[PDB]
Design a protein around this ligand. Structure first.
Ligand code: CL
Ligand code: CU
Length: 139
C-alpha cells in the first residue's frame, strides 16, 4: 500500500526529470523551490539519504498551506501505508512512496496548469515541522 500515486500520475515518457533530496540533518527538503513547465510529463526523483534514520516522501498538492493540511491530515490517518496520501485523496497531485533513510523513489506525473503549488512530506509531524517547498508551474 506504500506506493506512489496522485491524480496527475501518468505512464508516459518524461519530457523532463528533476531530483529532490532530503536535508541530511533536518526534517526538510534540501531544495525548497522547484520550477517546471505546465502540462508537461515529468519524473521527480526523491533521494532520501539522511543521518537521522528517518522516513520521508514528496507530495505535490493542488494548492497551498490550507490544501496541504487536508492532504497531510488524510495522510496522518493512513499508517497502514506508511503515511502516504491514500489513493484518490482530494487535491493530491502526485506523490512518491514513503522512503526509509537510504532509499530513493520516483513519481511520474503531468504538471498541472501554471500556478503555485506546495510540495510537502506527509510523514507524521514533518510538514508541521516545516518540511515543504514551493513548485512554480510556468506556461
Ligand atoms: Cl520524525
Ligand atoms: Cu519527511
Amino acid at each position: 500500500a506504500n506506493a506512489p500515486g496522485g491524480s496527475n500520475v501518468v505512464n508516459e515518457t518524461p519530457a523532463q526529470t528533476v531530483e529532490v533530496r532530503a536535508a541530511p540533518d533536518a526534517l526538510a527538503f534540501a531544495q525548497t523551490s522547484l520550477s517546471l513547465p505546465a502540462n508537461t510529463v515529468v519524473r521527480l526523483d526523491f533521494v532520501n539519504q539522511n543521518n537521522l534514520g528517518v522516513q520521508h516522501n514528496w507530495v505535490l498538492v493542488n494548492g497551498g498551506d490550507d490544501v496541504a493540511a487536508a492532504v497531510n491530515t488524510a495522510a496522518q490517518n493512513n499508517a497502514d501505508a506508511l503515511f502516504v496520501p491514500p489513493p484518490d485523496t482530494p487535491n493530491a497531485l502526485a506523490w512518491t512512496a514513503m522512503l526509509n533513510a537510504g532509499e530513493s523513489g520516483s513519481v511520474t506525473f503531468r504538471t498541472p496548469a501554471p500556478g503555485t503549488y506546495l510540495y510537502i512530506c506527509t510523514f507524521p509531524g514533518h510538514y508541521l515541522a516545516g518540511m515543504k517547498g514551493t513548485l512554480t508551474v510556468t506556461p
